[PDB]
Ligand binder design. Structure first.
Ligand code: HEM
Ligand code: UCZ
Ligand code: CL
Ligand code: CL
Length: 439
């Protein structure tokens, strides 16, 4: 194990971030962005992730970039990220195989499947986590949200059941694996990146074992495409290596961001009692109607009643900005507002910028869910051809979690030392809270 001389952790300039809100990280993104925008304006150049880079806090340019994917710009992560996610990870791929994998993901996460299958299981996994919560006892809201979102995705990707020893161990392995993307890409014994590469090998071996079992399942039930692993084996022509990277990546994407989104909602709501009251009123009415009909499990009609919840969700994503920026590269010389973006340079559209623009939002730094009672100024899931394939599941997860959360608990920050300080919220300790049962 190398004893490297001390120094700043993570990527140069930004610290431990690759563009999204990651709990438990040491990040300087907020100060970097505010200082450069103040000094150079909304479109400036720097050197980030090892390359000359144009950073865009300009809403028009960000829209222009996302809409011109494949023609003027393309998704482009640092090459070191390929070692973590794999050569066939759709999150970093462009071209025909990305198109095929996006089509798989859109089928896996379709509206039809949300209504018929995923909604029932979202509630089950929500209650599984919430029923274990104890009162008056400090814990990480982010950790608990990640338990929920990971269990849900592990169930529907590989049929793994919540709380089973193998499911908890895989989740722990993902912690080490995912830290690799925000670490300095130093492949030396003892570094977070090296450990992340080891975790990748461990996870890939686990997934391939599950794949061998599913191949037997398919053969036996011939003489089973319920989970994504079975579906891809039967309905796609992906190679083993491509199946492995796809599962690895969807399980990553399927629980990293949605857990943070739920933690952000918990954070914003504890500071806005009026919103909690209106949520409780909304979800109490939903429960009353279901009791009046003798129903016990949520259905799609219940979800459609959650009008103010959707306002809370929209406002949580607008102000919390799970995704701060995306990774692009110019395919040609591009001119915008008189500036030249050279061919081959990295381009980082800071998509959170339009969300905090006081030209687009009255009091953009204020958590005001009622603004959505009265998108082009709203892009927490991106835009253009790579728009989040799991956006509707993410909102369903937040809404169902909030539904049971506000019916069952009050909550409070571990200490009253956490005010929302523009521009970016960080969760260096995983949002510690305490709950009290409503009874
Ligand atoms: C609050 C939760 C989430 C947020 C804020 C979010 C955000 C985003 C964004 C901004 C993109 C565009 C990336 C780019 O253009 O480079 C994206 C893509 C994607 N998201 Fe999410 N996401 C969330 C949840 C999820 C979930 C729960 C899943 C799956 C279970 C998922 C699956 C995907 C996939 C597969 C893509 C890539 C689509 C493609 O490359 O064509 N996301 N997401
Ligand atoms: C973070 C996103 C939204 C830009 C990205 O697209 C993603 C996962 C991802 C994480 C690390 C790396 Cl290095 C690359 C991709 N997610 C998309 N949906 C949920 N997460
Ligand atoms: Cl507004
Ligand atoms: Cl925190």
């Amino acid at each position: 194990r190398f004893n490297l001389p001390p120094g700043k952790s993570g990527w140069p300039f930004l610290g431990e971030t690759i563009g999204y809100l990651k709990p438990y990280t040491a990040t300087t993104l907020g100060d970097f962005m505010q200082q450069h925008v103040s000094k150079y304006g909304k479109i400036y150049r720097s050197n980030l992730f090892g390359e000359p880079t144009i950073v865009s806090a300009d809403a028009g340019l960000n829209r222009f970039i996302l809409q011109n994917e494949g023609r003027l710009f393309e998704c482009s992560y640092p090459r070191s990220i390929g070692g973590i996610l794999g050569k066939w990870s759709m999150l970093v791929l462009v071209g025909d195989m990305h198109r095929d994998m996006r089509s798989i993901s859109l089928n896996f996460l379709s509206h039809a499947r949300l209504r018929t299958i995923l909604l029932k299981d979202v509630e089950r996994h929500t209650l599984f986590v919430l029923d274990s919560w104890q009162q008056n006892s400090i814990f990480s809201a982010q950790d608990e949200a990640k338990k929920f979102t990971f269990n849900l995705m592990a169930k529907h990707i590989m049929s793994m059941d919540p709380g089973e020893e193998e499911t908890e161990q895989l989740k722990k392995e993902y912690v080490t694996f995912m830290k690799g993307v925000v670490s300095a890409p130093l492949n030396l014994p003892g570094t977070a990146y090296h450990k992340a590469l080891q975790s990748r090998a461990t996870i890939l071996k686990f997934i391939e074992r599950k794949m061998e079992e599913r191949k037997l399942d398919i053969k036996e039930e011939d003489q089973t495409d319920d989970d994504l692993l079975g579906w891809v084996l039967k309905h796609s022509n992906l190679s083993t290596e491509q199946i492995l990277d796809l599962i690895l990546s969807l399980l990553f994407a399927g629980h990293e961001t949605s857990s943070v989104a739920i933690a952000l909602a918990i954070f914003f709501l504890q500071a806005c009692p009026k919103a909690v009251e209106e949520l409780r009123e909304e979800h109490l009415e939903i429960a009353r109607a279901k009791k009046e009909l003798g129903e016990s499990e949520l259905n799609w009609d219940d979800y459609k009643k959650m009008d103010f919840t959707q306002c809370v969700i929209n406002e949580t994503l607008r102000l919390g900005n799970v995704v701060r920026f995306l990774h692009r590269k110019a395919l040609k010389d591009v001119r915008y507002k008189g500036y030249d973006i050279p061919s081959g340079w990295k381009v980082l559209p800071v998509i959170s910028a339009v969300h905090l623009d006081n030209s687009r939002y009255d009091q953009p730094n204020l958590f005001n869910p009622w603004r959505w009672q009265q998108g082009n100024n709203y892009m927490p899931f991106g835009g253009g051809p790579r728009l989040c394939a799991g956006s509707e599941l993410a909102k369903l997860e937040m809404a169902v979690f909030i539904h049971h959360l506000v019916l069952k608990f009050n909550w409070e920050l571990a200490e009253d030392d956490k005010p929302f300080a523009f521009p970016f919220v960080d969760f260096p300790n995983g949002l510690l809270i305490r709950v009290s049962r409503i009874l």
